[PDB]
Amino acid sequence: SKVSVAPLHLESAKEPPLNTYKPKEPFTATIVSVESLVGPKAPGETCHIVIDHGGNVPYWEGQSYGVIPPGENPKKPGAPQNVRLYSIASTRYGDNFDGRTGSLCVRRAVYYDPETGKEDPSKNGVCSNFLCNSKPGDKIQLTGPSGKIMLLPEEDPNATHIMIATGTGVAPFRGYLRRMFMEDVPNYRFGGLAWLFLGVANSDSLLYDEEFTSYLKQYPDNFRYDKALSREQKNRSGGKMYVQDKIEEYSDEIFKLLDGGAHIYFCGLKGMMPGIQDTLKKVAERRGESWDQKLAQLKKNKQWHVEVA
Ligand SMILES: Cc1cc2c(cc1C)N(C[C@H](O)[C@H](O)[C@H](O)COP(=O)(O)OP(=O)(O)OC[C@H]1O[C@@H](n3cnc4c(N)ncnc43)[C@H](O)[C@@H]1O)c1[nH]c(=O)[nH]c(=O)c1N2
Ligand SMILES: NC(=O)c1ccc[n+]([C@@H]2O[C@H](COP(=O)([O-])OP(=O)(O)OC[C@H]3O[C@@H](n4cnc5c(N)ncnc54)[C@H](OP(=O)(O)O)[C@@H]3O)[C@@H](O)[C@H]2O)c1
Numbered sequence: 017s018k019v020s021v022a023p024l025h026l027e028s029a030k031e032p033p034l035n036t037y038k039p040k041e042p043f044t045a046t047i048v049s050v051e052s053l054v055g056p057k058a059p060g061e062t063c064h065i066v067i068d069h070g071g072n073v074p075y076w077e078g079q080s081y082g083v084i085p086p087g088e089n090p091k092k093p094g095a096p097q098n099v100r101l102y103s104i105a106s107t108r109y110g111d112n113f114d115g116r117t118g119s120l121c122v123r124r125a126v127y128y129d130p131e132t133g134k135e136d137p138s139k140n141g142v143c144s145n146f147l148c149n150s151k152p153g154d155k156i157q158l159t160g161p162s163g164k165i166m167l168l169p170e171e172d173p174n175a176t177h178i179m180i181a182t183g184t185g186v187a188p189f190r191g192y193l194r195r196m197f198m199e200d201v202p203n204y205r206f207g208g209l210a211w212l213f214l215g216v217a218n219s220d221s222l223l224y225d226e227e228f229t230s231y232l233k234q235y236p237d238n239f240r241y242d243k244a245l246s247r248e249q250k251n252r253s254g255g256k257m258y259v260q261d262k263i264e265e266y267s268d269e270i271f272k273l274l275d276g277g278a279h280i281y282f283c284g285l286k287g288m289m290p291g292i293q294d295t296l297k298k299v300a301e302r303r304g305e306s307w308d309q310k311l312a313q314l315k316k317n318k319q320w321h322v323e324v325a
């Protein structure tokens with residue numbers, strides 16, 4: 017059955033926390049664990065980081081933490097580094113079900129010369145490698161939380177939520193789905209449909225696949241799960257199989273759900289959105305509908321939720 021969580025007073029706030037800690041006086045949190053999420057054939061390393069905030073930096077699902085990596089702003093001598101934002105991949109109770117930790121899902125940004133393939137560590141991403149290089153007991157400068165675009169609408173506990181992720185864009189949806197299915201939250205009993213679409217390079221690049229597959233067996237009437245493995249599968253048109261191609265496979269069901277009030281969420285690569293728009297336009301055209309008019313209505317009805325970078 018569902019996992020007991022504490023403390024219940026995390027359900028009492030009527031508004032999400034915002035900017036509890038600011039860049040000039042961050043919260044000094046402590047690393048609990050860092051682990052790789054991926055196998056040896058993944059094109060890059062993605063890690064799962066558990067951070068002890070001690071209850072001092074609570075958040076709601078869908079929000080982000082800021083991390084200030086150590087060192088000096090290169091474009092501003094004497095200044096600290098700029099904040100980098102990370103979508104929180106845990107529920108408000110965290111991976112230890114106690115309200116004391118939050119988790120991040122972090123892709124290592126690594127530079128390769130585009131002609132020779134030669135790596136250059138000096139051009140690697142600062143914060144992402146700082147995080148995935150961290151060890152238990154290391155300190156992390158935390159800011160935030162921030163963000164409201166990806167808060168989960170809970171007014172209707174039987175709503176439908178269609179979740180479209182590329183890579184580490186899966187992060188908020190891990191939190192959504194643990195709250196919907198894993199945790200014993202008496203004041204949110206989800207009875208709708210949650211449908212996760214996840215695009216990653218290959219099987220070794222899957223993120224939290226065991227957890228999501230377990231929801232298929234535990235909640236077969238409330239959860240659906242489809243994967244697009246871009247370097248292991250090809251789409252109808254001959255391109256790499258992307259999430260937009262998986263959406264097209266279920267176009268009629270998805271459009272019916274949207275017409276019925278479903279929420280739809282997009283998180284991950286900003287580059288996926290032009291392809292998704294192109295696919296949805298083509299689907300609409302085949303149905304004899306205008307995607308522009310449909311998208312305008314979805315935005316007006318607050319059904320359309322995008323956070324990409
Ligand atoms: C709201 C929101 C939420 C999230 C994210 C963004 C936003 C806006 N991101 C992205 C994250 O904030 C951050 O941008 C990345 O982790 C990269 O930051 P670094 O500090 O590692 O790279 P840094 O900012 O240092 O560098 C940026 C890029 O430039 C490259 N670069 C540096 N010097 C170069 C040079 N001389 N020539 C060419 N290239 C060079 C780096 O290799 C890197 O790819 C994210 N990410 C994630 O993995 N998980 C998440 O959950 C989220 N969540
Ligand atoms: N809240 C947020 O805004 C938020 C949260 C988390 C992450 N992000 C951003 O999302 C990024 C996710 O990157 P990642 O490194 O984890 O993923 P990645 O491995 O670069 O890509 C994930 C999958 O998306 C595919 N893809 C590439 N181009 C695409 C396109 N135009 N349309 C559809 N799919 C496409 C990739 O295929 P190929 O590589 O085979 O082309 C891969 O299969 C992060 O780097 C971060 O910048 C943003």
Ligand SMILES: [Mg+2]
Nearest residue numbers: 054055220222
């Ligand atoms: Mg794996």
